[PDB]
Design a protein around this ligand. Structure first.
Ligand SMILES: NCCSC[C@H]1O[C@@H](n2cnc3c(N)ncnc32)[C@H](O)[C@@H]1O
Length: 394
DNA sequence: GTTCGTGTC
DNA sequence: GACATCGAAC
C-alpha cells in the first residue's frame, strides 16, 4: 500500500472511462502503475499526466507527463476527464503519534484548501476532495481508499460533498493490502448525476467482480451501511439505544496522568484505572491493571461525575462487535462508552447487557459495518435497537 | 468534551 | 490471529 496489487489496479481500470484524447491523471503516481495499466487496456490516444512530490519516486514512461508537486496544493492549467490512483493515507500530526509530518504552515494551507477538512482528518480525504475539484463536469474518479469514510464523523463533510458534487459508486474490497492493516473500498465518482450505489465484490483468479448490493438514489451524505431485510427488520423492532441513554466517553489518559489522586503503583485504598482489557461480555475485571494507573475509587467522580454511579459500559476498541457489562462497583475508566439512562427510562440491566452481548446483536453490527473500522463507534452504538423487554421509555 | 488509526503480543 | 490502541487532535 505504497503499492496496489495488480488485481486491484485492474479492477479499478475496468471501472475507468475516458473520451478519446481525454486527460487522464494519476496523483501520487511515483512510477505510474495506474497510467500504465489504463494505457495497456484502452490505448494511447489520451493525455497522460502524473503528479508526484518526491523526485526519487517519479519515474514515468516518456509518453506520460511527470509533474513534481504537492498534488494537494497543485494548480493545473486545465481540469481532467479521468483521475485514478491510490492516495497516500494517514493523519497529519506530531510524529510521536501520527504518520504524516509537515510544517504547521503547510497543514494550515491544507485546511484552507479543503472544505471537507474536519477534525484530525486524513490525507486520503484531502486527496478525494482535491481530485473531485480537478474533474471537468462529467469527469470520472477511481480511487482505492480505506473504508472508514463510510461511517466516521471526520468524513461527514466529505460524504456530503460527494453527494452534492455528483454520483457515487462504492465497491467494498476489505483487507486486500498484504501486510497493511486496513479494510479498503473502491470509489467510482462521476461529476454529474447524483445518488449512491453500494457494491460488494467477489475475488477470483480472473480478478474482482462487482456485486450490486443496494442503491440510494437520494443519498445526501448519510452514513453508508450494508443493509439487508434482516437488519431493517431488527431496527424497527425497538427504540434506538441512544434514545434511552446519554452516551459519554471515558476521561482520556492524560486527564488521569496529571490528576493528583492518581498513582503509578498500587496501594492502600487504591484501585486500578480500567481500560477495554478490563471489560468482558457480561463482567468487569476489577483486579487487573492494564493502564499503569491507580487511584482512590471515590475520587474518580472528580474526572467524570458519572464515575460515581453504577452504569452500563460498552466497548469501543474490540472491533465491530457489541461487548457490554454492568459496572456495579462504579470504578474509574480510562476507556470505553459510558451510558447514562435518560429521564423516565426504566431499565433491566442484566437482561439488557444479555441482549447487547447476544449473538443476534453481533451479526447485526457485522452485517452493517463489517470491518470498516476496528471499533464500535458512537454512530453505530446509538442506533442499536432495544425492545421493551430491556428498556422502556415511559 | 471525544475522536482516530493501526501496535504489539 | 488476539486484542486491543492512547493521546495529539479539535
Ligand atoms: N500512489 C502510490 C501510493 S501513495 C505513495 C506515493 O505518494 C507520494 N505522495 C505522498 N504525498 C503526496 C502529495 N501530497 N503529492 C504528490 N505525491 C505524494 C509519495 O511520494 C509516494 O510515491
Amino acid at each position: 500500500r505504497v503499492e496496489t496489487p495488480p488485481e486491484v489496479v485492474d479492477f479499478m481500470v475496468s471501472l475507468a472511462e475516458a473520451p478519446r484524447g481525454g486527460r487522464v491523471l494519476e496523483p501520487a503516481c511515483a512510477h505510474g502503475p495506474f497510467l500504465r495499466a489504463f494505457r495497456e487496456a484502452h490505448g494511447t490516444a489520451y493525455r497522460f499526466v502524473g503528479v508526484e512530490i518526491d523526485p526519487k519516486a517519479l519515474d514515468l514512461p516518456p509518453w506520460a507527463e511527470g509533474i513534481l508537486a504537492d498534488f494537494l496544493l497543485w494548480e493545473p492549467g486545465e481540469a481532467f476527464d479521468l483521475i485514478l490512483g491510490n492516495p497516500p493515507y494517514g493523519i497529519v500530526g506530531e510524529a510521536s503519534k501520527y504518520p504524516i509530518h509537515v510544517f504547521k504552515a503547510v497543514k494550515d494551507l491544507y485546511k484552507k484548501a479543503f472544505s471537507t477538512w474536519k477534525g484530525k482528518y486524513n490525507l486520503y480525504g484531502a486527496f478525494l476532495e482535491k481530485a473531485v475539484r480537478l474533474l471537468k463536469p462529467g469527469g470520472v474518479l477511481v480511487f482505492v481508499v480505506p473504508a472508514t469514510w463510510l461511517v466516521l464523523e471526520d468524513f461527514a463533510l466529505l460524504r456530503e460533498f460527494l453527494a452534492r458534487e455528483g454520483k457515487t459508486s462504492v465497491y467494498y474490497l476489505g483487507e486486500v493490502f498484504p501486510q497493511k492493516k486496513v479494510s479498503a473500498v473502491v470509489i467510482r465518482f462521476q461529476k454529474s448525476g447524483k445518488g449512491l450505489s453500494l457494491w460488494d465484490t467477489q475475488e477470483s483468479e480472473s480478478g474482482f467482480t462487482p456485486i450490486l448490493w443496494a442503491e440510494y438514489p437520494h443519498w445526501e451524505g448519510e452514513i453508508i451501511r450494508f443493509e439487508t431485510e434482516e437488519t431493517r427488520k431488527l431496527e424497527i423492532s425497538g427504540m434506538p439505544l441512544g434514545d434511552l441513554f446519554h452516551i459519554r466517553f471515558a476521561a482520556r489518559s492524560p486527564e488521569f496522568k496529571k490528576h493528583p489522586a492518581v498513582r503509578k503503583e498500587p496501594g492502600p485504598g487504591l484501585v486500578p484505572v480500567l481500560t477495554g482489557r478490563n471489560l468482558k461480555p457480561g463482567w468487569v475485571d476489577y483486579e487487573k491493571n492494564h493502564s499503569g494507573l491507580w487511584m482512590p475509587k471515590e475520587r474518580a467522580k472528580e474526572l467524570r461525575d458519572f464515575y460515581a454511579t453504577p452504569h452500563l459500559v460498552v466497548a469501543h476498541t474490540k472491533g465491530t462487535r457489541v461487548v457490554a457489562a454492568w459496572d456495579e462497583r462504579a470504578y474509574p475508566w480510562r476507556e470505553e462508552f459510558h451510558l447514562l439512562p435518560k429521564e423516565g427510562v426504566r431499565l433491566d440491566p442484566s437482561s439488557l447487557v444479555q441482549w447487547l452481548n447476544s449473538e443476534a446483536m453481533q451479526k447485526h453490527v457485522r452485517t452493517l459495518y463489517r470491518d470498516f473500522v476496528p471499533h464500535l463507534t458512537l454512530r453505530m452504538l446509538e442506533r442499536l435497537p432495544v425492545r421493551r423487554e430491556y428498556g422502556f421509555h415511559t
